[PDB]
Design an enzyme around this catalytic site. Structure first.
Site, short mmCIF file in Angstrom:
data_model
loop_
_atom_site.label_atom_id
_atom_site.label_comp_id
_atom_site.label_asym_id
_atom_site.label_seq_id
_atom_site.Cartn_x
_atom_site.Cartn_y
_atom_site.Cartn_z
CD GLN A 160 -2.89 1.23 2.23
OE1 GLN A 160 -3.79 0.40 2.13
NE2 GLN A 160 -2.81 2.07 3.23
CB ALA A 161 3.41 2.41 2.41
CD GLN A 218 -2.67 4.68 -0.52
OE1 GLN A 218 -3.86 4.58 -0.75
NE2 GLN A 218 -2.24 4.91 0.72
CD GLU A 237 -5.39 -5.16 -0.77
OE1 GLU A 237 -5.00 -4.08 -0.27
OE2 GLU A 237 -6.46 -5.28 -1.41
N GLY A 292 4.17 -3.12 6.94
CA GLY A 292 3.26 -4.05 6.29
C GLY A 292 3.82 -5.43 6.11
CG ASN A 316 4.16 7.43 8.02
OD1 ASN A 316 4.57 7.94 6.99
ND2 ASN A 316 3.33 6.40 7.96
CD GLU A 354 28.20 11.52 -8.37
OE1 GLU A 354 27.90 11.43 -9.58
OE2 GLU A 354 28.04 12.57 -7.70
N1 LIG Z 1 3.19 7.70 4.60
C1 LIG Z 1 2.41 6.66 4.33
N2 LIG Z 1 2.36 5.63 5.18
C2 LIG Z 1 1.48 4.68 4.79
C3 LIG Z 1 0.67 4.67 3.67
N3 LIG Z 1 -0.04 3.48 3.59
C4 LIG Z 1 0.36 2.80 4.63
N4 LIG Z 1 1.29 3.47 5.40
C5 LIG Z 1 2.03 2.95 6.55
O1 LIG Z 1 2.54 1.67 6.22
C6 LIG Z 1 2.33 0.76 7.33
C7 LIG Z 1 1.29 -0.24 6.89
O2 LIG Z 1 1.80 -1.00 5.77
P1 LIG Z 1 1.03 -1.18 4.40
O3 LIG Z 1 1.84 -0.72 3.21
O4 LIG Z 1 -0.34 -0.62 4.43
O5 LIG Z 1 0.98 -2.74 4.11
P2 LIG Z 1 1.27 -3.66 2.87
O6 LIG Z 1 2.66 -3.44 2.43
O7 LIG Z 1 0.19 -3.51 1.86
O8 LIG Z 1 1.16 -5.14 3.45
P3 LIG Z 1 -0.12 -5.98 3.92
O9 LIG Z 1 0.22 -6.24 5.40
O10 LIG Z 1 -0.02 -7.18 3.04
O11 LIG Z 1 -1.37 -5.18 3.69
C8 LIG Z 1 1.92 1.65 8.49
O12 LIG Z 1 3.05 2.19 9.16
C9 LIG Z 1 1.17 2.78 7.79
O13 LIG Z 1 1.24 4.01 8.51
C10 LIG Z 1 0.74 5.78 2.77
O14 LIG Z 1 0.17 5.89 1.68
N5 LIG Z 1 1.65 6.73 3.19
MG LIG Z 2 -2.07 -3.89 2.24
#
Ligand SMILES: Nc1nc2c(ncn2[C@@H]2O[C@H](COP(=O)(O)OP(=O)(O)OP(=O)(O)O)[C@@H](O)[C@H]2O)c(=O)[nH]1
Ligand SMILES: [Mg+2]
Ligand SMILES: COc1cc2c(c(OC)c1OC)-c1ccc(OC)c(=O)cc1[C@@H](NC(C)=O)CC2
Ligand SMILES: Nc1nc2c(ncn2[C@@H]2O[C@H](COP(=O)(O)OP(=O)(O)O)[C@@H](O)[C@H]2O)c(=O)[nH]1
Lengths: 422, 155, 417
Positions: free
Chosen positions: A11-12, A15, A63, A135, A198, A246
């Site tokens: 997700q992170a 996004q 997912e 995650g 964060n 570099e």
């Molecule tokens: N800055 C930022 N942090 C995010 C974002 N989405 C999730 N996080 C952070 O990432 C962590 C959660 O991990 P995720 O990326 O949502 O999980 P994932 O990699 O999809 O893995 P799964 O456990 O399979 O869902 C937490 O610390 C959240 O605060 C985003 O878009 N921006």
């Molecule tokens: Mg996820």
């Protein structure tokens, strides 16, 4: 003409990757359909016969919810379908699941898609890998991908953009476990990793942008501004950090302690004014309130320092501001320098975003011992839970062994001592 | 033996089989392996008619089994109100204590038979009776967080 | 994504049908299965509970009369005909009839309906089962169901809404036997169990709502509101991207300690600070345990409606800082909040509480003291052994439930050091 491939994981990573690629498009004047009416930007964008500029990127998640947003957003037409990879079930915030069970069902597909992008490269430099530490995918699947990329692309560089967990920004209880396990297993496969805290990005949005309660769009828009300043050198003509190699040279004297701290100024609300001098924006870089990671650099020593200016910056004005700064201590046998870089292109902001368009900005990249504070906090949370073996069965239930938690934690203890010896 | 058949009759609720067996000289205070009499069984399974016939023909109302369980203990435990009332009228020992230290009031209280708790109390049940673990029905009311029971025990 | 719902016994089918009724109004589904909402949010995660709209529900019972009860209800005609699996005669509150005899003959025909609904899922998330632990079918057959589903789908999540007996609502002396024999099965074969206690539901209806003689309809109104509240994040998009498995990983620090104490606010038949303190109040819990008699291992709080996210953040920190002593200090940041924009029916602001507290032992000690009182006098043991069941299963079960209580107290007095 040396290409860079960006891998966005979980997700992170997806996004933040969306925020980045939107901002690169505004900086290079590429349209949401990939057309460009006007080399440098080709490190990040390939071209199609039809004149489309396709990001050299792969988006991966176990997912589809997140990637489906990309498949129907502003840039739906910017990426070909094959660059967006999804499973049907995630790692449920469990590194073991993202690394050993669910992640193994899709690693091969992902490598084929990367091999397709790589066969379109004349001189691939390496990869930029975006993910959360917390995650299950961000931690487990990324570490699996880093291992495999070291084997299949052994002489190429790997930089990371990693999101450090913060309780203010919706963190999971087990994120301290995932964070330590991915760090241990990636520590020898990554060449340089820029951690984004964060909690730091959240306090800047509150303090400097007056946002009452920031969401991921606010945090990501600010993050992508910092990421673009770091990658600007690779997408434009430049003197400093013109290739992935570099970055190690300039910022990483000792291979294990490869976590530079990034500071960016000025962060000004679109609402708020007059314009800030080169002297003032430079001074802001040493203020701890402007860092991507919550730590006090005044309680530490510098091993390296790079200042990257953007916009209406006269070189003589920088030399004066740097001179002022020397009148902050350095590590024993390391040099006591500053590498400066200037891009005269004005800094770009998302139209109608939260950030104000300014005349000049700077990004300081420093490799300082004070970043160890961030590791101390994570390790402490790990120790409290591991002593009781809380949540460990979820990990051992998905193909993992308990001895791996111990190796990983020892590796962090050894990394904490590396910072204290230096 | 005729006592073995009587026990089965009392358990099974066969009013007429009971009467025929007694007419042939069956031991009204017969016992099974556990030391249970036809009255215990009748009291356990809610057979009030048999409880009455047995009490009229020499049944020891305060009989005990191997564990000190009286008919009243069992009727209170299972919650047969009319059977509790009949045994009491016929001289059942309201404060009889079994091997676990339990009185019929402890058991009514544990199982939540609040109408029986009232009936035992009105027939002189000792609220200050402690079990082997030192607990009274008042203590049990605190431990279980049962305010309906606590209120009945405060009078 | 998809959840298969199984409802077993009279309690299971009643609370089950009220659940479908509540969530169908939230998702704008009328009794024919047609959508009639005003928001895109209602239809985004409809795949989770509905098939394309028809509940993904399995209806089991040994008593054929509950079919007629189900069809009689407002949304009775929405369930699929092929999904009804019914016997010739009930279990008569005998767990052994449900688990080993009448129920075990019908249990295979249920697994064929499960296998049919499960094979039709894009990617099956898990199973949701509603039942009581006091009866015979829901407790005895249901635990058997759980066991056979777990052997067929060992990688899927198994979740239960289990209603605990209380003499205040059913004064049947054999129910502690049935609940103890089932709690033994739930400890080994469920990932997550929501302990809904009929004692708590009666005390709220009787003392707080002041209903002199509460009916199953008054009790089930709270179970349905709780069920809607806890499933909120599975059914609507919001700031959280999560499923049953992420809930399990972060809510369950040790395998056996997966018994949750749910609570709801407000209680029906309001500001954010007033909602927050109510959520940590014993009078709002659906399990009759005082949360101040133990410590929380993990807590999840779903807020529903339009409200200040900042006010939700600061008030939740204000609780933890004021009541540091009720949260274990060895699980950092063990209280998680989720704010969902859609409120429930007839309210503009709701809060749902999901606790994993060591005070749940109080609920189990209540059941054990009752089991013990009956087991010592060997009361009605013949009803069970007569259905082909070993007497030592009664001792296995008690022993296992007593172990569970020991674990809870171990972790209640454990320090960080
Ligand atoms: N800055 C930022 N942090 C995010 C974002 N989405 C999730 N996080 C952070 O990432 C962590 C959660 O991990 P995720 O990326 O949502 O999980 P994932 O990699 O999809 O893995 P799964 O456990 O399979 O869902 C937490 O610390 C959240 O605060 C985003 O878009 N921006
Ligand atoms: Mg996820
Ligand atoms: C699908 O529904 C839920 C799923 C989860 C959680 C949750 O509580 C808000 C839910 O609502 C009940 C959840 C729970 C508790 C946590 O820690 C106590 C955690 O680490 C984390 C969480 C959730 N993650 C976040 C950032 O809230 C993921 C699992
Ligand atoms: N709250 C609630 N409890 C119920 C309901 N129906 C039955 N019960 C309880 O469930 C137990 C009896 O279980 P039951 O489902 O009727 O037996 P089954 O049909 O064989 O599973 C007793 O503790 C009852 O109080 C109901 O609709 N709501």
């Amino acid at each position: 003409m040396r290409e860079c491939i960006s891998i966005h994981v979980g997700q992170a990573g997806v996004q933040i990757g969306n925020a980045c690629w939107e901002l690169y498009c505004l900086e290079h004047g590429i349209q949401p359909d990939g057309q460009m009416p006007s080399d440098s930007f080709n490190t990040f964008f390939s071209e199609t016969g039809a004149g489309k500029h396709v990001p050299r990127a792969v988006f991966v998640d176990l997912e589809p919810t997140v990637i489906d947003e990309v498949r129907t957003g502003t840039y739906r037409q910017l990426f070909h379908p094959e660059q967006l990879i999804t499973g049907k079930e995630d790692a449920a915030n469990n590194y073991a699941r993202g690394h050993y069970t669910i992640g193994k069902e899709i690693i091969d597909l992902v490598l084929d898609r990367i091999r397709k992008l790589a066969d379109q490269c004349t001189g691939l430099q390496g990869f930029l890998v975006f993910h959360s530490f917390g995650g299950g995918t961000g931690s487990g699947f990324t570490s699996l991908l880093m291992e495999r990329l070291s084997v299949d692309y052994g002489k190429k560089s790997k930089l990371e953009f990693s999101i450090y967990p913060a309780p203010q920004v919706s963190t999971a209880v087990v994120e301290p476990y995932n964070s330590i396990l991915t760090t241990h297993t990636t520590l020898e496969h990554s060449d340089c990793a820029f951690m984004v805290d964060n909690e730091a990005i959240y306090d800047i949005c509150r303090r400097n942008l007056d946002i009452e309660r920031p969401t991921y769009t606010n945090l990501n828009r600010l993050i992508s501004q910092i990421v673009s300043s770091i990658t600007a050198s690779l997408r434009f003509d430049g003197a400093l950090n013109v290739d992935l190699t570099e970055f190690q040279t300039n910022l990483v004297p000792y291979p294990r302690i490869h976590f530079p701290l990034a500071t960016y100024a000025p962060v000004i609300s679109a609402e708020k004014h007059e314009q800030l001098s080169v002297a003032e924006i430079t001074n802001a870089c040493f203020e701890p309130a402007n860092q991507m990671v919550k730590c006090d650099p005044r309680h530490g020593k510098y091993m390296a320092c790079c200042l990257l200016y953007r916009g209406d910056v006269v070189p003589k004005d920088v030399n004066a501001a740097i001179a002022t700064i020397k009148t902050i201590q350095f590590v024993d046998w390391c040099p006591t320098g500053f590498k400066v870089g200037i891009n005269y292109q004005p800094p770009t902001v998302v139209p109608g975003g939260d950030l104000a368009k300014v005349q000049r900005a700077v990004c300081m990249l420093s490799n300082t011992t004070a970043i160890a504070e961030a590791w101390a906090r994570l390790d402490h949370k790990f120790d409290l839970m591991y002593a009781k073996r809380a949540f460990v069965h979820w990990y051992v239930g998905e193909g993992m062994e308990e001895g791996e938690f111990s190796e990983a934690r020892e590796d962090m203890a050894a990394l904490e001592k590396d910072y204290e010896e230096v | 033996d005729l006592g073995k058949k009587l026990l089965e009759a009392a358990r099974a609720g066969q009013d007429d089989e009971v009467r025929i067996l007694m007419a042939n000289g069956a031991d009204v205070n017969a016992t099974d392996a556990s030391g249970l009499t036809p009255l215990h069984l009748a009291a356990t399974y809610g057979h009030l008619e048999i409880v009455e016939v047995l009490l009229k023909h020499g049944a020891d109302v305060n009989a005990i089994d191997i564990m000190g369980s009286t008919p009243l203990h069992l009727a209170a435990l299972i919650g047969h109100l009319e059977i509790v009332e009949v045994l009491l009228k016929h001289g059942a020992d309201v404060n009889a204590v079994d091997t676990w230290g339990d009185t019929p009031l402890h058991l009514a209280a544990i199982m939540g038979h609040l109408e029986i708790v009232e009936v035992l109390l009105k027939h002189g049940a000792d609220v200050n009776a402690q079990d082997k673990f030192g607990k009274t029905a008042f203590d049990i009311s605190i431990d279980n967080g049962n305010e309906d029971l606590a209120e009945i025990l405060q009078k | 994504r998809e959840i298969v719902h199984i409802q077993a016994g009279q309690c299971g089918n009643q609370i089950g049908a009220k659940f479908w009724e509540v969530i169908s109004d939230e998702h704008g589904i009328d009794p024919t299965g047609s959508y009639h909402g005003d928001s895109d949010l209602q239809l985004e995660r409809i795949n989770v509970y509905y098939n394309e709209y028809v509940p993904r529900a399995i209806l089991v019972d040994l008593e054929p009369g509950t079919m007629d009860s189900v069809r009689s209800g407002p949304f009775g005609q929405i369930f699929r005909p092929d999904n009804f699996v019914f016997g010739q005669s009930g279990a008569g509150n005998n767990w052994a009839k449900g688990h080993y005899t009448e129920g075990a003959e019908l249990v295979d025909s249920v697994l064929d309906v499960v296998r049919k609904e499960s094979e039709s899922c894009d990617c099956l998330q898990g199973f949701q089962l509603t039942h009581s632990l006091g009866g015979g079918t829901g407790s005895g057959m249901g635990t058997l169901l759980i066991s056979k589903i777990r052997e067929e789908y060992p990688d899927r999540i198994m979740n239960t809404f289990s209603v605990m007996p209380s003499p205040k609502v059913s004064d049947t002396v054999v129910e502690p036997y049935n609940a103890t024999l089932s709690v033994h099965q739930l400890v080994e074969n469920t990932d997550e169990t929501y302990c809904i206690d009929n004692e708590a539901l009666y005390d709220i209806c009787f003392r707080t709502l002041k209903l002199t003689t509460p009916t199953y309809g008054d009790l089930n109104h709270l179970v349905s509101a709780t069920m809607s509240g806890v499933t909120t994040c599975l059914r609507f998009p919001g700031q959280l991207n999560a499923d049953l498995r992420k809930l399990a990983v972060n809510m369950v620090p040790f395998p056996r300690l997966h018994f949750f104490m749910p609570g709801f606010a407000p209680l029906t038949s309001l500001t954010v600070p007033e909602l927050t303190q109510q959520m940590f109040d014993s009078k709002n819990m659906m399990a009759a345990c005082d949360p101040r008699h133990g410590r929380y291992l993990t807590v999840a709080a779903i807020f529903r409606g339009r409200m200040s996210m900042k006010e939700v953040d600061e008030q939740m920190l204000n609780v933890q800082n004021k009541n540091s002593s009720y949260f274990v200090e060895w699980i950092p940041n063990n209280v998680k909040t989720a704010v969902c924009d859609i409120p429930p029916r007839g309210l503009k602001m709701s809060a749902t509480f999901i606790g994993n507290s060591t005070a749940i032992q109080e609920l189990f000690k209540r059941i054990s003291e009752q089991f013990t009182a009956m087991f010592r006098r060997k009361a009605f043991l013949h009803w069970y052994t007569g259905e082909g069941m070993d007497e030592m299963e009664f001792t296995e079960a008690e022993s296992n439930m007593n172990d569970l209580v020991s674990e809870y107290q171990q972790y209640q007095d454990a320090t960080a050091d």
